[PDB]
Structures are given as C-alpha cells and as structure tokens.
C-alpha cells in the first residue's frame, strides 16, 4: 500500500544517518559499510510505515 512507500522513505532517511547503520569488519580490523540498518531503527520504521498505511487507508474510505 502506501506503507510501502513510507517504509522506503523512512529507510532512505535512516540510511542518511551514519549512526543508524551497522558496520562490518574487513580482514584488517577496519570498519566498512554493512548495508544493514540497526534492529531497533528497522522496527521503528515498520511501526511508522504500517501506522501510515492505516492512516491514509482508513482515511480515504471516508466516503
């Protein structure tokens, strides 16, 4: 639905903050992007996406 669009956006913004992202380690003990967002951040994204789904949906149905 629109919670799909929301999920995307909130994740794109999440990724914009170097902190919300997990880090991997190369064969030299050095950090590197992992491509994964921290667990609590991913959760809080879902909460907001689904909550935006109901919002827009149950709203539009207002006639």
């Amino acid at each position: 639905a629109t919670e799909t669009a929301t999920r995307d956006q909130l994740t794109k913004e999440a990724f914009q903050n170097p902190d919300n992202q997990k880090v991997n380690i190369d064969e030299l003990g050095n950090a590197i992007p992992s491509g994964v967002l921290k667990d609590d951040v991913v959760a809080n994204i879902e909460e907001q996406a689904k909550a935006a789904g109901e919002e827009a949906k149950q709203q539009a149905i207002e006639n």
Binding site: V23, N24, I25, D26, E27, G29, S34, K38, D39, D40
Partner: protein, 183 residues
C-alpha cells in the same frame, strides 16, 4: 667455585620490552624471558608441564594454558633452581572467527564483559603479533559482550588484540571478528 644459581624475579615481556614481573592477566602464547644468574654461566631450561608453559634453551617462556607450573633452570655446575609461574586471574584465548551469537556458543558465554578486559591485556603484553604464535597476523579484531542497547540494536562492540582500534556499532554478523574467550 661459582655462585649460587638464581633466577631473576623480574621478567622481560617480549611484546613491549617491559622489565617487570609476570603480569597477572595472560595472553595465551604471550612470551617473556627469565634471567638466570650464578652457576657456571651455562644454562638449560625446561617447564615441568608443557600444557601450561614452554621454554626455549635461551630462557624464553611461552604461556600455553591457564594454570600454574614450574620452570627449572640448570647450570653446568649441577645447580637447579625453580621459578614458579602462578596461575593468572584470567586468560585470553583467540578461537575461530564467528558471528557474535557463535562467539558466545564457542566461548560458553565467556566473551570479554567490558573493553578494559582486552585493553589491559594489550597494556600488559602489546600487539599479539609481537609473539611467536600470532607473529604473522595483521589483525585480530575481537568481540566484546553486548550491552542491552547494543543487543536491541543488533550489534556489539569490538577491540583489536593487535591494532587496538576499538569499534562500536559492529554488525553481529560480520566476518573477520575472532571469538576471544576469557577463562
């Protein structure tokens, strides 16, 4: 007509040229040198329990396992003196690389609780590659037991037995992180 063979109390940590007494926390395979004085100058060494320590003819010892053991020195003039190694408070063991969860498995949950547990080992020994066993390694990133936030977040901290370089926010599922157990 020689002197009463003795073994100097102070040892020489290889990894950091510190001349002091055997640190109270160990890096499995760390090494130090015993200095034998007295006797006819000619020396022979040996550990009474190779599972816990080993010693080369030049007097360089290697810690192989947690426990206590005796290192004997013998001179040409027939003199045997005992330098005793008393078991350490705890000991660092580098196991296999493993994602965090696996780290705990392999280590029976004995990963370092705080970072100081590994940093102190550094301060007492130095980069682990300064020693024979880790000699040709460029890095040994290690796991530091999660905290609650770390856990809800899906990551944990880390420290490097060689280059130090502590790093927080590390993906629990990253390769290249060793399961270092504390016993």
């Amino acid at each position: 007509f020689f002197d009463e063979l003795k073994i100097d109390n102070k040892v020489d940590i290889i990894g950091n040229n510190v001349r002091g007494e055997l640190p109270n926390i160990w890096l499995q395979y760390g090494q130090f040198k015993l200095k034998a004085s007295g006797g006819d100058g000619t020396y022979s060494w040996y550990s009474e329990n190779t599972s816990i320590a080993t010693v080369d003819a030049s007097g360089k010892v290697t810690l192989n396992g947690k426990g206590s053991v005796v290192i004997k020195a013998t001179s040409g003039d027939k003199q045997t003196v005992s330098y005793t190694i008393k078991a350490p408070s705890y000991m660092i063991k580098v196991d296999k690389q493993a994602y965090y969860a696996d780290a705990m498995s392999i280590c029976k949950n004995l990963l370092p609780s705080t970072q100081t547990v590994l940093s102190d080992i550094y301060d007492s020994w130095g980069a682990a590659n300064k020693y024979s066993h880790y000699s040709s390694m460029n890095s040994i990133t290690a796991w530091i037991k999660q905290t609650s936030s770390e856990q809800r977040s899906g990551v944990s901290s880390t420290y490097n037995l060689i280059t130090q370089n502590p790093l927080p926010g590390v993906n629990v599922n990253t390769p290249n992180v060793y399961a270092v157990c504390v016993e």
